[PDB]
Amino acid sequence: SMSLQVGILGNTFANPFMNAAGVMCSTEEELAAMTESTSGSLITKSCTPPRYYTLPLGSINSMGPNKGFDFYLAYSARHHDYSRKPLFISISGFSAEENAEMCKRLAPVAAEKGVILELNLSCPNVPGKPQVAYDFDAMRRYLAAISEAYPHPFGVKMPPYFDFAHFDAAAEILNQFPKVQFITCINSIGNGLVIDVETESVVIKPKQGFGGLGGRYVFPTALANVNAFYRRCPGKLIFGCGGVYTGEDAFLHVLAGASMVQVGTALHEEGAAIFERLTAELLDVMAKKGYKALDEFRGKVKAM
Amino acid sequence: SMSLQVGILGNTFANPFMNAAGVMCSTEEELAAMTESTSGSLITKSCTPALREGNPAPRYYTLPLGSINSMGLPNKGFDFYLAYSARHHDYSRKPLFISISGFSAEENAEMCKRLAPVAAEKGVILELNLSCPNVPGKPQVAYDFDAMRRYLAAISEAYPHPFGVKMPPYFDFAHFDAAAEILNQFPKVQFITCINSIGNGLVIDVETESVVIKPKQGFGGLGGRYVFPTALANVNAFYRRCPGKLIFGCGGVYTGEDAFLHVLAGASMVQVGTALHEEGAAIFERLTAELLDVMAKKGYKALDEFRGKVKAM
Ligand SMILES: Cc1cc2nc3c(=O)[nH]c(=O)nc-3n(C[C@H](O)[C@H](O)[C@H](O)COP(=O)(O)O)c2cc1C
Ligand SMILES: Cc1cc2nc3c(=O)[nH]c(=O)nc-3n(C[C@H](O)[C@H](O)[C@H](O)COP(=O)(O)O)c2cc1C
Ligand SMILES: *[C@@H](c1ccccc1)C1C(=O)NC(=O)NC1=O
Ligand SMILES: *[C@@H](c1ccccc1)C1C(=O)NC(=O)NC1=O
Numbered sequence: 203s204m205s206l207q208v209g210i211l212g213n214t215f216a217n218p219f220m221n222a223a224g225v226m227c228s229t230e231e232e233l234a235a236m237t238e239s240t241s242g243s244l245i246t247k248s249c250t251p252p253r254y255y256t257l258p259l260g261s262i263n264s265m266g267p268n269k270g271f272d273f274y275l276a277y278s279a280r281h282h283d284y285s286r287k288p289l290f291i292s293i294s295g296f297s298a299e300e301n302a303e304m305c306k307r308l309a310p311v312a313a314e315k316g317v318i319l320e321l322n323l324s325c326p327n328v329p330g331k332p333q334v335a336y337d338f339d340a341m342r343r344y345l346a347a348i349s350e351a352y353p354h355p356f357g358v359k360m361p362p363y364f365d366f367a368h369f370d371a372a373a374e375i376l377n378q379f380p381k382v383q384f385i386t387c388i389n390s391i392g393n394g395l396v397i398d399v400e401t402e403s404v405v406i407k408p409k410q411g412f413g414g415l416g417g418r419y420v421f422p423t424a425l426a427n428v429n430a431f432y433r434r435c436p437g438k439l440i441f442g443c444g445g446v447y448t449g450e451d452a453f454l455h456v457l458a459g460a461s462m463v464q465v466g467t468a469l470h471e472e473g474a475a476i477f478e479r480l481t482a483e484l485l486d487v488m489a490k491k492g493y494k495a496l497d498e499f500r501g502k503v504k505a506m
Numbered sequence: 507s508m509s510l511q512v513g514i515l516g517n518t519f520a521n522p523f524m525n526a527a528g529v530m531c532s533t534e535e536e537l538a539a540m541t542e543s544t545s546g547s548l549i550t551k552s553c554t555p556a557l558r559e560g561n562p563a564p565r566y567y568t569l570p571l572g573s574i575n576s577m578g579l580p581n582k583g584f585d586f587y588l589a590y591s592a593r594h595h596d597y598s599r600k601p602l603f604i605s606i607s608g609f610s611a612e613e614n615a616e617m618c619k620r621l622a623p624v625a626a627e628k629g630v631i632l633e634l635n636l637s638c639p640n641v642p643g644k645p646q647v648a649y650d651f652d653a654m655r656r657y658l659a660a661i662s663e664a665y666p667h668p669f670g671v672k673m674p675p676y677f678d679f680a681h682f683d684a685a686a687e688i689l690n691q692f693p694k695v696q697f698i699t700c701i702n703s704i705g706n707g708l709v710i711d712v713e714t715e716s717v718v719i720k721p722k723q724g725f726g727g728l729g730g731r732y733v734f735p736t737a738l739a740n741v742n743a744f745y746r747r748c749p750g751k752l753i754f755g756c757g758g759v760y761t762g763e764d765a766f767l768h769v770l771a772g773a774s775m776v777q778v779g780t781a782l783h784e785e786g787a788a789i790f791e792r793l794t795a796e797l798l799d800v801m802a803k804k805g806y807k808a809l810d811e812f813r814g815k816v817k818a819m
Binding site for chain 1: 679
């Protein structure tokens with residue numbers, strides 16, 4: 203009598219789980235593996251018109267690499283089985299102009315197939331360019347340019363914030379753009395640094411070893427960002443991303459406000475079989491509490 | 507022939523370790539325990555001009571991989587820590603730092619005016635907190651570069667001695683460059699402590715479905731293993747950008763290997779917060795032994811043989 207279904211963006215998703223953009227989604231074989239999996243959805247690698255490393259408590263990466271917009275647009279147009287599950291496409295152009303150009307072309311494919319855009323405003327490894335959403339004027343201009351060029355709804359992938367003045371400013375900007383229908387919190391925590399004791403060397407080569415953190419390191423930061431935007435953007439959906447390894451982690455993301463739950467580091471380590479385990483663990487927690495649907499507790503974190 | 511000594515700021519420190527501000531340093535009993543410990547130094551709780559009781563409890567919580575807190579600046583008040591520095595601290599045991607965290611530039615400058623004669627006579631060293639993440643309505647001062655500059659200007663006018671600054675974590679090179687450009691314009695800033703807690707994380711208990719600390723809807727500063735790669739990145743970013751200042755490392759230190767990495771990234775002193783909260787002051791015996799082990803396996807005889815020498819790829 204229980205269900206993980208999520209009914210959003212006019213679709214019924216079988217469950218809230220999907221891969222995080224950039225994990226298991228660059229090669230046609232990875233897309234296929236994601237489509238074959240029990241995940242509720244999947245998203246493509248952020249496309250444009252040692253770089254990874256496993257840590258004890260997560261991951262660090264300086265990917266900075268994609269088969270181009272045309273490969274993922276082509277996959278969205280005539281290669282993805284939409285009868286299996288809905289599909290998201292991530293774009294991370296190097297300017298508002300590039301982003302707008304890519305959106306003009308995705309518009310027909312989005313109308314004819316139903317693929318959904320997530321705009322990446324938070325790459326932390328872009329040489330010479332800080333996270334777009336750490337610059338609220340650039341953020342506003344990207345969103346305006348995309349809203350004028352792109353007729354369909356879209357979502358935004360946000361970087362983590364760390365104080366209420368930034369939450370308030372970010373939400374006030376997003377609330378002016380009705381085409382932004384969902385907000386994904388969070389991208390990796392930017393520009394961490396990992397050093398190996400034995401070699402006394404950084405573990406990734408680009409950018410003097412600085413890279414984005416994922417995994418167990420980022421979970422309380424991810425929950426905070428999910429909840430902060432859930433409270434400030436009641437007219438939008440929040441997707442949670444960050445630190446999910448168990449159905450109990452996913453349960454907390456939903457409690458904080460998440461509609462969908464994306465899985466990055468833990469999926470990179472465990473492969474697509476993880477979604478079989480995650481759905482069963484989440485249903486297990488719900489059973490123990492007597493919940494029958496996610497709508498019963500999404501966003502219902504209590505003050506103590 | 508191996509040595510953990512640090513010679514900085516006109517002082518000799520027996521080793522690089524001290525508490526992080528706010529941990530085991532609020533009462534006379536805690537400060538005495540830190541002085542009797544084997545730490546190379548110690549720092550007082552960040553203080554305000556008047557006594558404060560802090561945020562309502564629970565305001566601290568132990569996490570799987572660290573801590574979250576919204577302490578809210580509970581502290582005995584500046585007069586108490588000034589008196590400890592002036593009259594109670596045994597400087598023949600080790601040097602002392604005092605952390606101040608007034609709610610405005612003027613509050614800080616007034617405290618510095620009274621601290622100045624005690625610093626001159628006794629040698630206590632000031633650390634200015636520009637990174638509380640739990641001040642109601644006032645964001646981390648160092649997240650607002652105009653306010654940061656204003657604070658440093660006000661302190662530098664009011665205070666004749668060199669001092670240090672406790673910094674929040676930054677997460678992109680544009681902010682590192684902007685913060686370092688400001689710090690490099692104030693010659694009295696002699697050390698930079700990276701980092702304060704990662705601000706405004708959130709923890710929820712599965713069983714009760716509720717936040718685990720009371721203030722601010724459950725939001726609070728993260729310490730511990732969560733913050734270690736961020737802390738090293740901040741230590742190294744400012745080590746590279748502020749060669750004329752010392753960097754003190756703070757964040758995620760539970761072992762001598764963690765401390766070794768802080769020093770490799772550029773740290774002169776290494777501060778210990780969450781781990782010391784959990785283990786108590788005997789931790790410093792373990793950390794010095796562990797760091798000496800790392801050094802012995804590598805043939806290092808002094809910290810200057812590898813401080814700041816992290817290798818690129
Ligand atoms: C190797 C790797 C590549 C990634 N590539 C992208 C990307 O292209 N676009 C994006 O928005 N996020 C990207 N991410 C970030 C993830 O989508 C996610 O936000 C982050 O890893 C936090 O989730 P996690 O804790 O489950 O790893 C990447 C992460 C990793 C580890
Ligand atoms: C309970 C608690 C109280 C703290 N109080 C202060 C403080 O008064 N002033 C300050 O600069 N930092 C304070 N901090 C931050 C620590 O000094 C330190 O920067 C942070 O905990 C990261 O270090 P760690 O990973 O070793 O815990 C406090 C941290 C905790 C957990
Ligand atoms: C940013 C990215 C990289 C290549 C193409 C498009 C976007 C990406 C990264 O490298 N590391 C991250 O942690 N998150 C990202 O989104
Ligand atoms: C901030 C603080 C502010 C005024 C007086 C004393 C302490 C403090 C906090 O509450 N939590 C932290 O993580 N770091 C701090 O410095």
